[PDB]
Design a protein around this nucleic acid. Structure first.
Ligand SMILES: [Mg+2]
Ligand SMILES: [Mg+2]
Ligand SMILES: [Mg+2]
Ligand SMILES: [Mg+2]
Ligand SMILES: [Mg+2]
Ligand SMILES: [Mg+2]
Ligand SMILES: [Mg+2]
Ligand SMILES: [Mg+2]
Ligand SMILES: [Mg+2]
Ligand SMILES: [Mg+2]
Ligand SMILES: [Mg+2]
Ligand SMILES: [Mg+2]
Ligand SMILES: [Mg+2]
Lengths: 135, 131, 80, 156, 199
RNA sequence: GUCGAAGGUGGGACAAAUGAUUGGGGUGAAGUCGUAACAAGGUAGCCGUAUCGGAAGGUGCGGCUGGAUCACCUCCUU
RNA sequence: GUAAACGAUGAGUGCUAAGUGUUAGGGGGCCCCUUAGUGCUGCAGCUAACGCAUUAAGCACUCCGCCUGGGGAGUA
RNA sequence: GUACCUAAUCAGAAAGCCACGGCUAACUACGUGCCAGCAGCCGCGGUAAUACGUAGGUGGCAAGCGUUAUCCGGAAUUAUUGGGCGUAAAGCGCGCGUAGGCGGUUUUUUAAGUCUGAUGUGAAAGCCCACGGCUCAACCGUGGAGGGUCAUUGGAAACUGGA
RNA sequence: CUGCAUUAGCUAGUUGGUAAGGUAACGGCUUACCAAGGCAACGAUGCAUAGCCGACCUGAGAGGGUGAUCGGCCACACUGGA
């Protein structure tokens, strides 16, 4: 563009979207409204727990939970590790990070936080799965 | 229509230099003549002739080529333009090619080179770069 | 001792009684692209005798508030 | 002459049955004293591809004007969509460059410079852009001779 | 020291005698581990820069954070960044004590200064990170003037660089001037480390 | 007595949530029907418009070459 | 009030090798020169390449319109 | 009765986290067998898995190490610096024309822009440079430098603007 | 010193004058009278969001992001008026 054109209409940068929108929102119950606040994690209650089939070419029964967060937004959160002790009404902590195989699963359930138990028999990379040091 | 005679002159010089022409005739003006004189003094061109005819006169530049037919003028760039004019201070005068080139400037003390602008401690409108 | 700001500008309306609006013209530079762009500011100045007329280039000086939006007084008519 | 293999690439030509694979090697050769060149070689194996590339690079060499281990002035070398900006630095800066540009500069013997690949990052065109810049570099003595003056007159 | 590990394995990994004797490399000059022998892979450019940085860091027995901070402060000095970094590493009280020879090993000198057997200008200094400067003197605590380790190291007459002027009778060293690149170890290419911290 | 917060009454404006029901959109596994496009894709394709048909699409009018092609004439370039 | 409304190429301006047709003119001796169009071939230069190349997609200046991954969608 | 100092006793109480297919430093054995599971992108796993889990070893860090969230960078990916619009996204289907932007040559004049000098101010703390004090450092302190599109005032007239 | 035109008209004490009252103070600050003025595509009005700055983070820079701790200025003290 000409300099005159830039003066008339300045350049406009692309707007960036978050990969974890559900974590950017809190809820005020008194005013019954949403608020913009960045959280690293949010608490939620497992509305459902079960398995999902990944999209091709992968094949599996991937463990996940449908969770209603403290801000009333319902999301799908993957359950990492081998074996879990989660059921409906379990209170879980949810962090960002989607599962590429799973289309609508955009968050992870932290292991070893709130109700969720650490992975049993895990010994390498334990902090990632909430397993205490065996010693 | 025509909007920048200085840009037209610089582009004439650039095109002639590319085609390796020996001489170049263009319509004249005082600013163009001063630019040509600066180029000659600095050694980028060979000779400058003014033809005081009717219709504002003519400038006849003679370009300079070194041994091996190497071009003395590597490039000319219009800096200040009608669409956006550029000025610099004496302490902010730019060096073309780390000093190996000249910046033709227009100052209250006449159109001079960046070296003279720095020496006299003056700024002005940076007309062009030549290297 | 201390002097007050003085401006020069054209008269763009005088329908008000004893008040003329003076358009002072300036050129603010674009902060990023650096181009020179026109900038007009209208000044409401006191014209006691209605001497100034629409069009003439006049001179104004800053004063204390004289009305809701009048802060200047006509000093002289530079041209007409 | 030191030699550095910039990239090795397995290319394929399709035939009535299967494919014919070859190895292409891009190599830079330099004496670390102001002479640098690059070459490409194609062969059925990478050692032979490298050998052919080195021979071509030695055939094609350029002289890089320098000033105490850095270039005389800022330059942008361009080839196709390749584009490399290069700027003289001060001693102890190091060579601030990435990819094939660092190979070209180090083998040319430059030890202090700043650079930025502004264009395509395909290695052969990056190398060609860098070589174009180094070829278009100029030195004070040569420009003074071309303009019919002295270095002192040039710098005023 | 802070890194209490197999200095022989570190020397074997980095292909350098951190002690300076060469004993580690004499028998097995290849890297430790199951794949140590018959190891023939070629390091990348990043690998080479990292190896140079690790060589210098483990030579001076420092942690990564302190090493990086020292490099940063050296960069602010006038001159060549790499040379300034090397001389600044040399100026550390650990290095000065080891060069003076009050201990046979750099880690031993570090433990001496940490436990306070050393005095700078006649005052205790417990911090091996202390950056010595020209014109200062390093002495030994009177209560520890007759330590077996220190006396044995003094008896073993090691070379004393030019920038240090030592007298074993008084166990008194002097930091005369700043070192030079030639005096400082030549097995390190400081430009590689400068580039490593460039990226 | 003037001014005057709150309040009341009224018709409008704007925003959000929610609503029987409804519309297309996206994704998804070997689903069902056909085969429109890519070769002249077996009716060259595509564009605007109109209308028809389960569906892709067909058909009409004008336009484009970003169309293959055997014979013919008409020119231009080397 | 829309089309592949196309040269898929905004308008104005100047400058930068050549060869050869054709439309409507002009000047000097079938030839030469010349103005404005309309074609083909082709340097320098440009280009990712194809190609463009005095009818630029080269070199420059002024102003306007427009673009910023594919779908969703020219939809709500 | 804290900092700090002195005297005695003991290596004895005081190392964990992540990673090791490429990017990217670090590889082997078992178990599993498109399952369990991993995954930032490309992808990995169906019997020879350096990619899943464990083990040995190795790499990076270390009283911290990883994950998530958010911002700048890399991104010249809104391009003034510093990009484009024949075929990649991009020239309105085409006129006529308003505001605005821009504008041929010379002479005289003005000083709005433009250039230059002086004065005041731009608090302190902060950043940067130097020095000094905590054993070092962080930190603290003291000087210097910086930061205005700032204002007042005096000068120049080439270019842009006005006459 | 901020975003939006899928916000284009806004304003009637409103803009100016006269007189008086009122205030520490000038002033449509308020009232009475006369006039029809005032703002706006150089973005008025409307809507949304926001305490501002010294500074802080990042970037080679130009720029981009932020406005904790500490200092300055402002505003508020269950909500509204006095
Ligand atoms: Mg070749
Ligand atoms: Mg078909
Ligand atoms: Mg068909
Ligand atoms: Mg039909
Ligand atoms: Mg259309
Ligand atoms: Mg079109
Ligand atoms: Mg023609
Ligand atoms: Mg950017
Ligand atoms: Mg297109
Ligand atoms: Mg068109
Ligand atoms: Mg201050
Ligand atoms: Mg608020
Ligand atoms: Mg940048």
């Amino acid at each position: 563009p000409t300099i005159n054109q830039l003066v008339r209409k300045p350049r406009q940068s692309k707007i960036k979207k978050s990969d974890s929108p559900a974590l950017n929102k809190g809820f005020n119950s008194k005013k019954k409204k949403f608020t913009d606040l960045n959280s690293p994690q949010k608490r939620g209650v497992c509305t459902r727990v079960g398995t999902m089939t990944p999209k091709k070419p992968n094949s599996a029964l991937r463990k996940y939970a449908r969770v209603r967060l403290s801000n009333n937004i319902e999301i799908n959160a993957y359950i990492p590790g081998i074996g879990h002790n989660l059921q409906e009404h379990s209170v879980v902590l949810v962090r960002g990070g989607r599962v590429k195989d799973l289309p609508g699963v955009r968050y992870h359930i932290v292991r070893g936080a709130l109700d969720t138990s650490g992975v049993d028999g895990r010994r390498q990379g334990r902090s990632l799965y909430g397993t205490k040091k065996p010693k | 229509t025509m909007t920048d005679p200085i840009a037209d002159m610089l582009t004439r010089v650039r095109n002639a230099n590319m085609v390796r022409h020996e001489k170049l005739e263009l319509p004249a003006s005082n600013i163009k003549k001063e630019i040509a004189e600066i180029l000659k003094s600095e050694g980028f061109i060979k000779n400058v002739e003014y033809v005081e005819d009717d219709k504002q006169g003519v400038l006849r530049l003679f370009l300079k080529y070194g041994q091996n037919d190497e071009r003395v003028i590597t490039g000319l760039k219009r800096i200040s333009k009608p669409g956006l004019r550029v000025y610099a201070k004496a302490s902010e005068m730019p060096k073309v090619l780390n000093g190996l080139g000249i910046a033709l400037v227009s100052t209250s003390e006449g159109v001079i080179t960046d070296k003279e602008a720095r020496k006299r401690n003056v700024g002005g409108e940076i007309i062009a770069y030549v290297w | 001792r201390n002097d007050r700001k003085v401006y020069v500008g054209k008269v763009v309306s005088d329908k008000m009684d004893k008040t003329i609006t003076v358009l002072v013209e300036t050129y603010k530079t674009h902060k990023l692209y650096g181009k020179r762009v026109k900038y007009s500011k209208k000044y409401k100045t006191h014209d006691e005798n209605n001497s100034a007329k629409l069009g003439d280039i006049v001179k104004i000086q800053e004063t204390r508030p004289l009305s809701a939006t009048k802060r200047f007084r006509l000093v002289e008519i530079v041209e007409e | 002459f030191e030699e550095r293999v910039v990239t090795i690439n397995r290319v394929a030509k399709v035939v009535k049955g299967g494919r014919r694979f070859r190895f292409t090697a891009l190599v830079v050769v330099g004496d670390k004293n102001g002479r640098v060149g690059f070459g490409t070689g194609k062969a059925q194996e990478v050692p032979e591809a490298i050998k052919k590339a080195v021979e071509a690079a030695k055939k094609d060499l350029v002289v890089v004007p320098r000033v105490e281990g850095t270039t005389p002035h800022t330059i942008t070398g361009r080839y196709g969509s390749g584009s490399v900006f290069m700027k003289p630095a001060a001693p102890g800066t190091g060579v601030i460059a990435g990819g094939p540009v660092r190979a070209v500069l180090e083998l040319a013997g430059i030890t202090d410079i700043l650079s930025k690949s502004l264009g395509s990052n395909t290695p052969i065109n990056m190398v060609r852009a860098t070589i174009d810049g180094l070829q278009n570099l100029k030195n004070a003595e040569d420009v003074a001779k071309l303009r019919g003056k002295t270095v002192e007159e040039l710098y005023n | 020291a802070r890194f209490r590990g197999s200095n022989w394995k570190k020397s074997r990994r980095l292909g350098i005698s951190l002690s300076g004797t060469g004993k580690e490399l004499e028998k097995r000059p290849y890297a430790p581990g199951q794949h140590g022998p018959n190891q023939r892979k070629k390091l990348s450019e990043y690998g080479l820069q990292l190896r140079e940085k690790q060589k210098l860091r483990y030579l001076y027995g420092m942690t990564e954070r302190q090493f990086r901070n020292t490099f940063d402060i050296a960069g602010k000095k006038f001159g060549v960044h790499g040379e300034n970094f090397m001389i600044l590493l040399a100026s550390r009280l650990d290095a000065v004590v080891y060069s003076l020879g009050l201990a046979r090993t750099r880690r031993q000198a570090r433990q001496l200064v940490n436990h306070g057997h050393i005095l700078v200008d006649g005052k205790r200094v417990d911090i091996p990170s202390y950056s010595v400067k020209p014109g200062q003197t390093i002495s030994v605590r009177e209560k520890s003037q007759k330590l077996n380790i220190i006396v044995e190291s003094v008896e073993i007459n090691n070379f004393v660089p030019e920038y240090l002027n030592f007298d074993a009778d008084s166990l008194t060293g002097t930091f005369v001037r700043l070192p030079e690149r030639s005096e400082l170890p030549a097995e390190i290419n400081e430009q590689l480390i400068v580039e490593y911290y460039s990226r």
